[PDB]
Structure formats: C-alpha cells, structure tokens
Amino acid sequence: RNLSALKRHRQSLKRRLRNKAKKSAIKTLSKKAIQLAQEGKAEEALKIMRKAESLIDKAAKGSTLHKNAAARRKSRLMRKVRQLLEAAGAPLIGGGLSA
Amino acid sequence: MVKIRLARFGSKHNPHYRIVVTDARRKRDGKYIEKIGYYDPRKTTPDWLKVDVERARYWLSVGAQPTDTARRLLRQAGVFRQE
Amino acid sequence: TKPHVNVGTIGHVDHGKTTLTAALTYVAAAENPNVHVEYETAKRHYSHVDCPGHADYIKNMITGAAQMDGAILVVSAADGPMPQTREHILLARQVGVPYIVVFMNKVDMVDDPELLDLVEMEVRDLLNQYEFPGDEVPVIRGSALLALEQMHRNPKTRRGENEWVDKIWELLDAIDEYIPTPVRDVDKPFLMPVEDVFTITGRGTVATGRIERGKVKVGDEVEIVGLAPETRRTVVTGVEMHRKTLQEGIAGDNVGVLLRGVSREEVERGQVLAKPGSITPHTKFEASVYVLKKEEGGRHTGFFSGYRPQFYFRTTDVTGVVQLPPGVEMVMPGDNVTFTVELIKPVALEEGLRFAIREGGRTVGAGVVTKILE
Amino acid sequence: GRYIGPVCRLCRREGVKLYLKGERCYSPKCAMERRPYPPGQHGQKRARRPSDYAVRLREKQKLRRIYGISERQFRNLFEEASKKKGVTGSVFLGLLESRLDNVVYRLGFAVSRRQARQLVRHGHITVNGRRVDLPSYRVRPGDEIAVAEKSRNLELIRQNLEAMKGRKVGPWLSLDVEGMKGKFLRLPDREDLALPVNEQLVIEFYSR
RNA sequence: GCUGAUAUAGCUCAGUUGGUAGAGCGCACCCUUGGUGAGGGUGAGGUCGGCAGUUCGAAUCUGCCUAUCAGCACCA
RNA sequence: UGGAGAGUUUGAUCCUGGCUCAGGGUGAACGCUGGCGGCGUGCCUAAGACAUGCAAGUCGUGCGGGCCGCGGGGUUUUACUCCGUGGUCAGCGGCGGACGGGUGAGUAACGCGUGGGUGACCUACCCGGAAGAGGGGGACAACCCGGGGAAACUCGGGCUAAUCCCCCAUGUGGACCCGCCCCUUGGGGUGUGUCCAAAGGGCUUUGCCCGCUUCCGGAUGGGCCCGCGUCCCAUCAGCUAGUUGGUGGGGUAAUGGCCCACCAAGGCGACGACGGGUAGCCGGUCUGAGAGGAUGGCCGGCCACAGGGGCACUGAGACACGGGCCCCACUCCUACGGGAGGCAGCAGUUAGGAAUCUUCCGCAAUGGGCGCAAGCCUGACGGAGCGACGCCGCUUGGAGGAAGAAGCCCUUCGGGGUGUAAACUCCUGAACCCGGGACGAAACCCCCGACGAGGGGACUGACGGUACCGGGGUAAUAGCGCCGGCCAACUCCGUGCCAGCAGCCGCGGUAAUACGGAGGGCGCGAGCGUUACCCGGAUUCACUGGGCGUAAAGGG
Ligand SMILES: C/C=C\C=C\[C@@H]1O[C@](O)([C@H](CC)C(=O)NC/C=C/C=C(\C)[C@@H](OC)[C@@H](C)[C@@H]2O[C@H](/C=C/C=C/C=C(\C)C(=O)c3c(O)cc[nH]c3=O)[C@H](O)[C@@H]2O)[C@H](O)[C@H](O)C1(C)C
Ligand SMILES: Nc1nc2c(ncn2[C@@H]2O[C@H](COP(=O)(O)OP(=O)(O)O)[C@@H](O)[C@H]2O)c(=O)[nH]1
Ligand SMILES: [Mg+2]
Ligand SMILES: [Zn+2]
C-alpha cells in the first residue's frame, strides 16, 4: 500500500521542529534584546546581542537559516541596537559591538 | 554533476552515439553543452571514432565525469596518456 | 483432473429445479476443498445450468439444453406430473442430451403409500411415452430444501449425517454413475457457439459458450463469424472457466473467452469462434430436413414453397426463406425433404451441421446442412 | 507493380514503335508492324489536335513506359533530376540509364528491358564483387556489372550473351564477353541515347 | 436476449365492430405539345408489415417473427 | 537559378469582377479492394471516470538489535549465550524521490523569443587550491512489558549506539556594528570588538581509501531585471487606492508594493489603456519565384499543470507527479467508531466520437539513482505486436507464340476490337523445405605496474536462431477511379425533365459520349477514389504588386 518515503516525512516532523525552536529562540532573543538596547541597558543589552549573535550563527550551522539568512539578521540586530544606544547610552560593556 | 556521456542518434538498430558534455540530469538525447566526438558501434567505416582531445581534457581539468564506457572510448582515444 | 461434464436441471415451474440447484452445490463443499453453478464430487468436476424452466425464456433455455450431457427432471412429492414438465421434456430429445435422472424433491411432503410410488408411475409412464429410459431411471427421494438448511447451520458435513444430507448423494452417486462422459474430438479445429457477452476492467469482451472442437489458450487467432458486417479475426487473450483460469480449455467446457482489443457490439450471441478458416458466413444452403409429423407435436397442416419459419443453429434463432426446388410444393408433415434456406442474416455454416426448424411455440422440423448455395 | 501485361499494345497507342518484348518486338511484327494505331474499337479515325497537354502526356508515357518504371519512381526520380545541378534534359535521362537492370539489358545479358528486371530479382546479376537484386540500384562510374556463376551455364544466359559477338556496346560501357563484365564508364549522353523522346516536353508535363 | 407499443395503397392517414376493405393529394394510356401545364376524355389497382394455425368466412380472436421506439436483462 | 494557365455574365466584344478546375501539404477519416519488408507513425474529442498489474530506489564501508543457518562453548554442563561470519525483516541515520517520464488545462504573460544587466543573488553532487578535523554531555526509534482497536494504526514507561543531536576550545579563515583607504548601486583591502567550525568508515595501520569543517577559485544549472518582438473585437473608451512615488520596517538567497504602517498625490490611455474571445511559446512545419500566407502534432528548448481549491513542512533545490495538512465533488471497506483512493507515468477498460495501439520482452546496449565495489532499483529505454496512416523498397513472371481460337461487343454484312492478350514451349523460382548463422560488447572487474599512463586477460545479447550466406524449389493477388468540356479516354443498349448525374458550366422531356449496364479506352497500382482542412494559382487586402469620373469606392 505505502512507500518508504514516509521515512522522509517522519525524518521531517523532527528537523521540522529541531530548527523551529532554534528559530523562535532568536526571535525571543532579538525582541528581549533591542527591548533593552533602547531602554538604556548598555551592559545588560549587548549581553543579549552577544548571546544572540551566537544563537543566530549556530542556526546557520544547519539547514535552518543559512548563508545570509543570519548574516542578515545580525547587521540589523547590532544595527538596530546601537542605533538605540544613542538615546543617551554609550556602549558600556563593549561586548559584541565595537567602538 | 557535469558528465561526459553519449546520445543515441541514428535509426533503429542503427546506432551512432555522440560523445558529449552535459549536466547529468539532462535527458540522454537531450540538449547538451558542447560536442567532443562520435562513436559507431557496428564499426562500419574506419572512421568510427574521434574525440577532440584538446577539448576533451579541458572538461576534465575542470571536473567532468565520463561514463564507464565513455571513460573507455577516451582510453582508446588516449586522453590521460602523458608519457 | 477429474473428468468434467456440463449438466443442468429441467421441469415444471415451482417444483424446485431452481433450489435443488442450491442444495447440489453447498453439500459438495464439505468433502471437497475449494468449492450456472460449480460443485465437484469426490470423483468428478461439474458445470450446472439452472434453466429458467418457464415458457418465454425457453428460447435461451433450449440453448441451455444444447449445452449439457444430462438433464435432471425435478419433481415435487405434493405435486408430481405437470404441464411445464411435459414440455421441458420433449425438448430433451430434440437437443441431444442423453440419459435423464429424475429427482422427486419435496419428497418430504404429505405421506402416502401410492403417491410416493404412485408419482413414479406418472413419471416412468410419461418418460417412455417419449422414447426414453422411462423404466430404468435413477429416481431419488429426499427433499433438498430440507437438506439445504442443514448445511446452512454448520458449513461442514460429510457422507449423510442428516438423512436428506445423504439423500443428496442418491443424486451425487446416481449421476456420477449411470451418466457416462462422451467424446469431444479435440483432433478437430476449434469452434464454440456464443451464449452471452460480458465486459471487464482491463479485459473487456468475454465470450461464454461450449467448445465444440479442439482447444484454445492465450495466444490464438480466431474468427468471429455470426451475422452483421464481416467475420472478425482476433486473438484470444483470456481463457478462464468457472470464474477461474483454464489453461487450454477444450471441447466440453464453457469458459469465458477474452477477445483482444474488441468491443461488446462486434461480439453478440449466435456467433461462432473457430480456427482462422474454420467456418464462414453463408446465407443460402441445401439441407435434408425432416418435417415433424402432426402426431409428433409439430405442424398439423403442412406448407408450400415461400413459407418462412425460424431455424435454430447451435445457439442462434433466425428467420429464412424456404425455396423448394422445382417440383417441391405442398410438402406436408411427417415428411423428409430437401430444399434450401435463405436466412435474412448471414450465418456461420460448415456443411453437415445439425439444426432444427420451428414455428409458433412448437418444433416443426429437423434438418442438417447438405451444401451451401451462397 | 511494374505493370505486367500486354506491352506490344503500347508499341501502338504511343504510335512510336516499341520493343519491350525484345526479340519479337524486334521482328517483322513488333505488333507495331501491322497496326501503327492505338488499340480499342475506334483506334483509326480522325484525331482532335491533341491538346498542348496531350503531347506532353504521350512524351512522358512514351519514356516512363519504355522502361517499366511505374510513375511513382519515374516522377520521383525526375524530381531528383531537378535539384541536381544542371540541365534536367540529360541528367534525368542519364539517371534513367543508371538503372541496374536497364544497364544489364543495355549490356546484352537479357533480350529486353522487362527481362533484365527478372535477372536482378533472382540473383543472376552482380556488381563490383557482391551481387544485387534491386532493379532500382543506381549505377556509379567505373562499376562493372557481372553475371553470377550459378547462372553462367544457363541455357538463356547463353544465347543472350551470344548476341554480343560482333555488336559493340554503348560508348560509355565496356565488355568482357567471355568473362561477362563490362563497366559503367560514364553516365550516357543525350545523343548517345537515340530515343524517340522529346525530353524537353516530358519536362514541361510536370510544371503543370 | 424477456415484455409493452406502433407496422392498413406511392403518401397522409378513415374506419370497423368477425364477413363482398375508403378519401383526396398523386398517378397510367389517351386527344394536345416539341415535352410539360392547363383543358375535354378513360379508369386501374390494396399480400391490411411478414411466414403460418383456428372459422362456413381472415386486416379484427389465436401462436410465431422482422425494422424501429421506451425499460435498476446483462463483470470470465 | 527563379515566376505557366484555363471553365463561367454576351447575339457577339472588350473591361471590372465573384465563383470554380489543373498543383503541392496531412497525427486524418469514410468507401471498394488488400501479398511482403524495412524506416516512420499511431485520441486531433472527455485536463472524463478508472476493479488489476508495474512505474524509485540504493547503501552494513554511519550505527544497534530482531532472525534463519554455520564457527568455539563461558565453568566443568543449560547458567552473566560472550564473540568469529554470510544471508534476511522492518528501525535509526545518509544521498536520492524537485531529474527521468506524462499532459496542455491554464495562460496575451517579461509566459515564450532574443540581445543584454546582476556594485541586487543562489547552486547538492563535480574537479584546483589554502587551513584544518582536540576534547566533550544526551534523546528517540529498534527491542522488552502493559492498552484502546474492525482496521488503518497507535498510547504509556523503560533501557540503547551512532556520520543523529547540543556545549568549550581551536579562528587558517568567513559572517556582523563601527573607522580609514583605493573603487563607485552592496566590489576590494584594512584595524578593535563581538560570533560559528568538525564524524569516522575500510582493509594489507606514522599510509592509502570515501567521507567532515571552514575558506577560496573553476565548472554546471538556476532566480530576479531590462530594450525589442508576441493573435482578433473599438458595436469596449476611459482604467486604477497598495493604485504611482517617497520614508522607515517585515520578509528574501536577492531587487521591488512582494507584504505593512506613514505621508504625497500620482500612474496608465487612441503609439489602443480597461474589458471581451482565442490560445501553451519557439526551434521549426506546408505552401509561395520571392515577399508573404497558414501552422506550432513526431524529436529538442522554455514555461505551465499532476482529480478541483488552498497551504506548509523537508531541503542546495519543491510549496513537491507516484510526500504531507485541510475544504470540496465522487468512488470503496466498515464491527457504521473512522479509514481509503487520483494511470495528463507504462500496458489496458469504458464514456464520446469520424477516429487513433499490446494488460509485452529485455535491462545486452545507452542513460539516470545509491555504493569502495560487487551490484541493486529503472514500464526512461532498446526491441517486438497491432493499424496499407505515411513514405521508400518488392512480387503476382521473363523470352518466344496466329492474317488473328473460343467467348463477349460494334458492324456502311464486306468484316473490325478485345490480342500476343490467353493457350502452348522453354526459362527463371516470391514462397514454402534444409544447414550454418551475425556485428552491435567492452568496460566496470582481475593481473604486471602506485586502483596513473600503458600493457594482458575474462564474463556479459532482450530483438534471435531474426538479419545476412550456402543448398533445394512450386508460376505463384489485383484493385479503384475516370472517359461532354475545363482534361488524357468512344460506342451499343435501357431509360423518356422519370429513374438519376453533377467541383463549375451544366447533361436527362423516345437516337443521351454527361443517368444505368455492357464492350472498349485513359490515368495509377496496393493502392485508388470521396470528405475535411492549410498554401497556391488570387496583383482576388496589392511591400514587392491593385484601385476610387458610369463597373466596388471621395468624405455634402
Ligand atoms: C428445438 C430447438 C432447437 C434445436 C437445435 C438443434 O437441434 C439438432 O439439430 C437436432 C439433431 C437431430 C434436431 O434437428 N432437432 C429437431 C427435432 C428433433 C425431433 C426428434 C429427435 C423426435 O424424433 C422424431 C423425438 C422428440 C420423437 O418425438 C416423439 C415425441 C412426440 C411428442 C408429441 C407431443 C405430445 C404428446 C404433447 O403433449 C405436446 C408437445 O410435446 C408440445 C406441444 N403440445 C403438446 O400437446 C418421441 O418422444 C420421439 O423421441 C441438434 O441437436 C443441434 O445440435 C441443435 C441442438 C443445436
Ligand atoms: N415442500 C418443499 N418445498 C420446496 C422444496 N424445495 C423448494 N420448495 C419450494 O417450492 C417453490 C419453488 O421453488 P424453486 O426452487 O423456486 O422452484 P423453481 O420454480 O423450479 O425455481 C418454493 O416455495 C420453494 O421454496 C422442498 O424440498 N420441499
Ligand atoms: Mg461472480
Ligand atoms: Zn513491339
């Protein structure tokens, strides 16, 4: 009746999730990131962006977001962030971003 | 990948394959890249195989996979031989 | 394996010929693994044709008589002699059918000294009245109705555990014995009249009918000669008897023949499938006939050239013009003749083939092709 | 197929004496010698100025019917004789000469055209080595047509091959009479071919 | 393959009430023409779809069968 | 190197002009007749519905067990069954199902065609080069036990190994915020900071072998974009609100209104917008002297669709032919609680129709998938079958053979035609009978040599016991159309504007070359006629190449 391609489906619902999570982590990361980079959390702001960069790239390591997929999200995270650490911030903990 | 197979030209029972380069996924007698030489099975005519050596090599120096019998028609065509 | 023989029932309506048929199978399944109907004793294989046993349907019942080696006159205990019986009985001689085994069914009904043996008197007396073994006939006793419900309880029962169960063998023993198996000359070409026509998923047109000569198998060229257009040559791709594949299916087995790539129109009844070159369409032909006398049930008057009755060849029923050769005029009954027929429909003839000449719900004459005019 | 039938009836009709039967069609009775007129019931009464058409029809037929080539080939072969660089006059005619069987006939071997054809359809003929049975096989320069061996001792091959002693072959063909060979030195010529045919008309018959 | 209905002169189509089968449109030979129309003349025929049985009497009651029209006859 | 004409308006003539014939083309059909082979080709309608079979799998050289048979019994025996080793059944994990194949429904469209741009981009496997591959934790299947259940299956808990998964270093390197430099749409280099690498499998084990990580260069195939070209209706005239642009975001591999907020009001249109019809486009195809006209089916190229409609996951790649999620129409099972199904893949049924194929043989070749290989899967493919559908090749006989049978038909009764035609005599010998009997097939592999070059060896053929060769050898199918003219081909009879013919003009009303048969004759031949449809002739939509004072046409 059936074909061993379902093999290719179950083998999906899996990765189908494996990267879904890695995804929604960067989202809940980024939000919770800029969410503080604009408030004035210089230190404990980059802290997150430096954490993000990490979680984002590793995603790249897989079939999830690839190539520019993250190279993109970065140039906006640290982009957006710093463009907030100017509402009277000064990148205290010069963790990820650079002067 | 990019291989070096053959295309079945010639009537029924009357083959006349054509040695050529083409992105594997193509259809046998399907559009290919550039021609390299021919082959006549029944060996009718002492002119039943040529292969543009010079050209045959370029395609390899850049990564071209021949067939198993394509490998051969080249072996008969002394392509790897370098002395 | 076990020799095969196409059989059936006959008789007057409501007697039970239709249901006796029910009993015959069933039972035969207990002591026989893997079991028109099909059942098989522990000695033979079998084909049965419950006839419609009723006026009107006769026309396809007679074609049912042509298709059998033996008739099973069924009769009721409470009843006995009956009109439809007297009828579906003389037609037993006309259309071959050698030997006849009467089964007094409903046996289990109103007791009586005579009756039981008084009925065998209205039988045996009515049997010789038609020049048959009216004296030495296998008359069995044991209502099949009643036995057909004993096997329904539990689908397994050997050699008669319920009286009537064994009384079903009085037949399953009286028919094996008594009624031998004739020849079906396979050394001849091929041939076999068409009874009906079916259609199927992937297959298509299948032909039902008895094989007369030789044998067929997948990969054989054949001719479909039988009225309309012209003979149609086709290859047989399906040879299955009784719902299951028959390998070479010879003469004496009504299998379904699948004629490659055809339609269900080009293959209607009264046709014939034979060896490419066996039989051809012929509309005019000589033939020595036997006008059936008035005392034999047929014409009680006679006729004159120009008459036009109906001839029944094999499994057909057609109308032709009788052109009596100069001098041949008012040829009365009980008389044999020799004239010609000109069927209004081209038909499959092979010179020296038997046929009859009827008219008006009665048999009028017996003929056999002599030579073919056209 | 290639007609097959009364052919000394066309000796008539076209009224330009023909010899498709060879020996007899060559005697004092080519059928033509007794009836210079078309067959049929009438055949000998006034004639309407044959239409510009007509003419061309007789001219073709005259030729096409002078070989055995059934239209289909002839007109087909005609076409080939067009594209071919050069006058359609010669060429075609030549092209009609290139016929293996004809050639045979052209080179003794057989008494008439209709005969040379059977010779090819039975094996008796053979070219530069291997043998041929296609009346259609077209002959090329320097190719010699040879009789087979199994036949050489045949009653017919005899007499027929005898008619050579003395007579000479067409100026584009040779002949080893004893070794039955003779080559095809070159596509014959308009003048060489003394045929009762006005090619230039047969041509005109196909533009319309 | 089972029934049901329709089968009436060349065509339309009347009817009966079991018994010497109608109407007109047409149509055939006339006189006339070149031929026809028209005009004046003369009429001459129905296998009641077909083969067959019943009656003293068969197109009307019986039986069969043929072209055609309508039907949950109809997968070895 | 290339152009041909006529029949028809008259009492007759010339002019305009419509119609029509002679030509060539066809995936055809219908009629009558039908012997062969090879090469082609074979639903043009219902993108209708499909009882069955087969189309996509392959790795133990990624890993761990189930299991059937063999090595040696842990100890000392059956015990903690440990291990040597090949089949085998799923499961895990990998590359592959996104090509091959099928169809044209849709679509007037940057869809296709074509020439370009990408400083706006991707690409598995494939070769070149640079650097590497050190340590670490764990889950779920398989399996064992318990359950619901008609079933399809599936729920609970418990171990378990990996090239499956996550964390650290490692930073040759690449990705990002920012600053400088040369360059100019995001390309190239440079400094600080941040951020990511990774798997072991095989045997002959400090060395090969297929892999892994990141980087870069090459190749191949792609996405997007642009000028240009792309059918009819104007009795269709105005069309638009995410509509036109901006700004900042989301999303993307990437540009962009693609999407969304904000503003501004634009954008398009007689150079034909908006709407309606039709239709997959080209390479090409038929015709034509050419220019044009008509066309887009065999094969290739691009696109589109996979029962109808929507969608996302997986991945380099699809929003997925034979995978998934849902709605719908419809079919099948049903323990009536919830399952199952898409042949526009191959073979075939049926429905419609004027009409279009075998439930096939083989993987030997070729080609594609997976592997170290062996080799396995392959209805793509290579062959075969049916169909005069087409083309080309072939036969039904060849040479004799009468002032001229017979029969049939005209007949100025003298005699003329069928007719050398037949008969007959030679001869050849399609078939049928006999034996031999193919190439296509040489490599993966093995051996010397490093699995290099090179050299050496072997197995392997579905069509086939067919083709072709040699031997023997029987005279052995013919049919259709037409004969007043256009147009090759004439007479007798029957018929009496009746029966009937007819592409056009027209024939038939008691002599018919025209109706019907006959004799005869002409074209063609397994074909030949008819119908349908494209071009031509038609300078008859005219550029080539026309016309408008009365023929068609000047606008009052
Ligand atoms: C009859 C239908 C189809 C026949 C088909 C073919 O018949 C056959 O051609 C056949 C070949 C011989 C054939 O021609 N049959 C054709 C003919 C065959 C005739 C044969 C034999 C006879 O002999 C003279 C035979 C019956 C004979 O008659 C006697 C009977 C007399 C009866 C009088 C009636 C009586 C009292 C009566 O109450 C009565 C009645 O019966 C009917 C109606 N109303 C009545 O009131 C006696 O019984 C003898 O035995 C082949 O068999 C074919 O193979 C076939 C089967 C295809
Ligand atoms: N008394 C009795 N009646 C039976 C028997 N068999 C059948 N019948 C009844 O007889 C009648 C007709 O039966 P059926 O088989 O149809 O007879 P058919 O007319 O020959 O087909 C029905 O009522 C049956 O049930 C039997 O053995 N005995
Ligand atoms: Mg059944
Ligand atoms: Zn002559």
Q: Which domain holds residue D102?
A: 97-184
Domain ranges of chain A: 1-99
The token pair at D192 is 């060489």
**Statement to judge: residues D116 and D163 lie in one domain:** yes
- Which parts of chain C are beta strand (E)? 4-10, 45-49, 70-76, 103-105, 140-141, 196-198, 206-209, 220-224, 232-241, 244-245, 255-259, 273-274, 280-282, 285-291, 310-312, 318-319, 339-341, 347-349, 354-358, 363-369
Nucleotide nearest residue C360, measured CA to C1':
E64
DSSP A63-90: SSS-HHHHHHHHHHHHHHHHTTTTTTT-
Q: Which domain holds residue B4?
A: 1-83
Ligand 1 atom at shortest distance from the alpha carbon of C129: 48
Residue D55 belongs to some domain of the structure: yes
Residue nearest to nucleotide F93 (CA to C1'): A11
What distance in Å separates the CA atoms of residue A58 and residue C204, rounded to the nearest whole number? 63
The token pair at B19 is 């040695």
**Statement to judge: residues D77 and D143 lie in one domain:** no
Of C321, C346, C39, C295, the residue nearest C169 (C-alpha): C39
CATH of the domain at B42: 3.30.1320.10
Structure-solving method: X-ray
Residue D189 belongs to some domain of the structure: no
CATH of the domain at D162: 3.10.290.10
Residues 6 or more apart whose Cβ sits within 8 Å of residue D96: D63, D67, D69, D74, D77, D102
What distance in Å separates the CA atoms of residue B44 and residue C349, rounded to the nearest whole number? 58
- CA–centroid distance, C17 to ligand 3, in Å, is 21
Q: Entry resolution in angstroms?
A: 3.6
The DSSP output letter for D56 is H
**Statement to judge: residues D104 and D142 lie in one domain:** yes
Which CATH homologous superfamily contains domain A1-99? Ribosomal protein S20 (1.20.58.110)
Pairing state of beta strands C70-76 and C4-10?
parallel
Instruction: For residue B37, give the H/E element and its range.
Output: strand B35-38
- CA–centroid distance, C290 to ligand 1, in Å, is 11
- Mark D55-70 as b/e (b = at least 16 C-beta within 10 Å): bbebbbbbbbbbbbbe
**Statement to judge: residues D119 and D68 lie in one domain:** no
> Is strand E in 7 Å reach of the CB of C309?
yes
**Statement to judge: residues D122 and D150 lie in one domain:** yes
Distance D31 CA to F41 C1' (A): 48
CATH of the domain at D24: 1.10.1050.10
What distance in Å separates the CA atoms of residue A35 and residue A49, rounded to the nearest whole number? 11
How many structural domains is chain B composed of? 1
Residue D1 belongs to some domain of the structure: no
Q: How far is CA C346 from CA B18, C225, C284, C320, D53, in A?
A: 60, 9, 9, 10, 51
How many structural domains is chain D composed of? 2
- The catalytic site residues of C sit at 14, 17-18, 54
**D: neighbours with 3+ CB pairs under 8 Å?**
none
Question: Taking each helix axis from N to C terminus, what angle separates C113-128 and C83-94, rounded to the nearest 10 degrees?
Answer: 40
**Statement to judge: residues D115 and D166 lie in one domain:** yes
What distance in Å separates the CA atoms of residue B77 and residue B72, rounded to the nearest whole number? 8
For CA atoms A61, A62, A63, A65, the dihedral sign is negative
Question: Taking each helix axis from N to C terminus, what angle separates D88-97 and D72-83, rounded to the nearest 10 degrees?
Answer: 130
What distance in Å separates the CA atoms of residue C148 and residue C168, rounded to the nearest whole number? 9
Nucleotide nearest residue C240, measured CA to C1':
E76
**Statement to judge: residues D124 and D55 lie in one domain:** no
What distance in Å separates the CA atoms of residue C113 and residue D106, rounded to the nearest whole number? 110
